[PDB]
């Protein structure tokens, strides 16, 4: 029912056009998310049998870290590092690489992919604005019918 | 052509930097332009504006790293050796600024540049912090106030490194 | 900026400063030097002058030719020619 | 003048004329063609082997230029030349005049590419075949 | 109506099974191009109608034609996927 | 294997073109990160011998604060300030400048550099979109070969 | 070979025709024709 | 060529030429770094 309005309706059509760009972003983001998640989950908690919790650990933290909510306090707690400085004086020396991988990962996701998505949105918007208005006038007839 | 002096234009940053670090091992095996042969090649390579510019960068980079190390490491109960080296370094910088002041096209032309203003802020912050520390070297509070001022210096010297 | 600056880096630029100060002291007080000064002959100066005036003339000819090859100028010139052509037809009709 | 090399002696008159054209173009001051030939480091037949009189009087022959252009293009250029078709015994062949034309145009085409004369290059490209 | 029918037939032929093939690409393009042109014509004639008498143009757009089982031109235009005709101010005025 | 697809392949080529802009952003960001980190690390914990933990403290917090995860509670804990208001009633008066430096720093990184990176991405995208399509058609041949 | 040389000739004819249909070329050609037209009028006036 | 007969153009593009050690024109175009030739619809059609 937003389609009757001259402001909300064409923007909805443009949003449905963007969905392909959003899906494209998801496909690019999936590589880093699965790769970093399997690698990071193995580095944080080694010598553990595979279970459903391992898969949930692979999927949970990497996806929500690209929106700026970092689980560094939670990762610091899971790494069993007792020093005042967070990733120092740990039982295993390999778990200190956990922030470095992350350092590459959010560089890949926030610095690179999100800004690329902004560029695709501006280009896509300029390309399909007139077509969205024309399609809105056709959907106006569709509502009338 | 003025930038590269008597040197071929195909020379890269790494080649000139390597030749600066290894003078007797990279300079005879390169193409550009006895006592009057070795001296001529040395005077032609080292009279170029590009080599001195690269040397000034590297020098300012060391200054930033060494001064950063100095601020991070604890102050001693007397004036340390690294403090004396940095003192000699900033006087030398101050004399270079005075030389720039005398030989330019007026005080206004010198002060128009923002980097010269940044240089003045560097020298002023370092001397305030150094005299604050040197006034009472065994006083803990003087070291704390001096390190507080020297935080601002490290910020300006990394800003000055963008030149 | 880096043409007039001494070559030696910042910890060691004090040696360069005292070297320039030593030269300044030897020139002002001692007066034992006379620096270096190089001039240019009149022939190469007149060669530069002749080259510059020839290239100035060449640029003006090329600029004039380029302005005559524009579409607006060609339409205007074509229009004036067609106006003079009508004038010549008036003369022809007078002769008829 | 007569030459002891049998490969150089089988060459027709127009090939020597293209060599004369290269020589005339090369004799101009600060010409990049002469610098290219000197930097190439090849012998009279263009082979990468680096007497002297034969190497200087006929330094701008077409075979050496073919080798230099061949090295500039890719790793497997090898043009097959047949100068035996310019003899009078092959005159009865029907289509020989097209091939004879095409080959001649091709050699002149390469010369026009070397001197960066685009208009001649385009014209020699038009007369011959294998345009693309 | 003939322009809409022509645009629809050329558009359907351009994606038809009989026109797929390596050699038919330019032909397909030509069909699509001609379709677009006919669509433009349909808009142009419509525009002229709206310029002369808007109410009479509305009566024309509301008229049922026997050739498409007794329904009007806007339904035909929608069935022909003519975006240009539907976006015209006269058609939008009738829909409003 | 994304290069076969008409959507994911040219976007990957554009991403490889952006990598230079990402590197440019890293070079600009390095100045503020190292400068603020050495200055801030010295202000938080003075009169301490240099160690590896000092270097880790220089690198750790400044980099992750530009993605919006602020360690202000952690910095407040390290500053030994016992007041209800966070940077008040501290043992040393110099450590109260720690949020101010940060105030300049995230202004330099998020407000200035990130938005500049967005501008470079839009300009770079518009410049190399047609070249990315042409290069994708060449890489199509490369895959075929 | 015959197909390629025929299409080469066809492209050159089409390219030549396209370059003669440009606005700049038509204005230049029209201009030269008007210059020759003035020349013919000078000849006509001489005959008068 | 693609305008006149697309299949014959494909045969022309698939033809091995002796001058580059018996391989076709698309390999030559790739070796010449000709981006414009590779992006053409006829060449892309042969590759598909
Ligand atoms: C090109 C890239 C992908 C390869 C990077 C090299 C990686 C695989 C190597 C280089 C240095 C290595 C580290 C060197 C030292 C140690 C300390 C040891 O107690 C645990 C392993 C650990 C932490 C190594 C893990 C693997 C390591 C990080
Ligand atoms: C892979 C490319 C991008 C760069 C390579 C850098 C990698 C190999 C470096 C950068 C940071 C490094 C880590 C930094 C600190 C430590 C603690 C030390 O006690 C053991 C090695 C360890 C855990 C290092 C392992 C190797 C490491 C991960
Ligand atoms: C301009 C930007 C990209 C600067 C780059 C930041 C890099 C060099 C910094 C930022 C955060 C840093 C990591 C933070 C914490 C730790 C844990 C420690 O036990 C080993 C080193 C390690 C793993 C650091 C390695 C270097 C690191 C990845
Ligand atoms: C131009 C810019 C870079 C220079 C800024 C001036 C700086 C270096 C000066 C100006 C005011 C100064 C502060 C004034 C008062 C105090 C309180 C004292 O108990 C500790 C030092 C401290 C906190 C000083 C630290 C240095 C300070 C911040
Ligand atoms: C440097 C340019 C950008 C602006 C200069 C502003 C600086 C010098 C100002 C702004 C905020 C100030 C601080 C604000 C509050 C206090 C608490 C006081 O009990 C001691 C001084 C101290 C710690 C100030 C030191 C100087 C300070 C850091
Ligand atoms: C529009 C924007 C830029 C407004 C600018 C905000 C500035 C003026 C504000 C924001 C946060 C503030 C700081 C927050 C906390 C403290 C600790 C206190 O003990 C001294 C003052 C000090 C250091 C403040 C100085 C002024 C400050 C930096
Ligand atoms: Mg200066």
CSV table of C-alpha atoms in Angstrom, one decimal, chain F residues 130-131 133-138 140-142 144-145, chain H residues 24 26-28 30 35-36 38-40 44 47-48:
chain,number,residue,atom,x,y,z
F,130,UNK,CA,33.8,-0.4,-18.6
F,131,UNK,CA,37.5,-1.6,-18.4
F,133,UNK,CA,33.8,-5.5,-18.3
F,134,UNK,CA,36.4,-5.6,-21.1
F,135,UNK,CA,39.0,-7.3,-18.8
F,136,UNK,CA,36.3,-9.8,-17.7
F,137,UNK,CA,35.7,-10.7,-21.4
F,138,UNK,CA,39.5,-11.2,-21.7
F,140,UNK,CA,36.6,-15.3,-20.0
F,141,UNK,CA,38.9,-16.2,-22.9
F,142,UNK,CA,41.7,-17.0,-20.2
F,144,UNK,CA,38.3,-21.0,-21.8
F,145,UNK,CA,42.0,-21.4,-22.8
H,24,UNK,CA,44.2,-18.9,-34.8
H,26,UNK,CA,42.1,-15.0,-31.1
H,27,UNK,CA,45.5,-16.3,-29.7
H,28,UNK,CA,47.2,-13.6,-31.8
H,30,UNK,CA,45.4,-12.1,-26.9
H,35,UNK,CA,41.2,-5.5,-25.4
H,36,UNK,CA,38.8,-4.1,-28.1
H,38,UNK,CA,38.3,-9.5,-27.4
H,39,UNK,CA,35.4,-7.5,-26.2
H,40,UNK,CA,33.6,-7.6,-29.6
H,44,UNK,CA,32.8,-13.5,-27.6
H,47,UNK,CA,34.6,-18.2,-27.3
H,48,UNK,CA,31.1,-19.1,-25.9
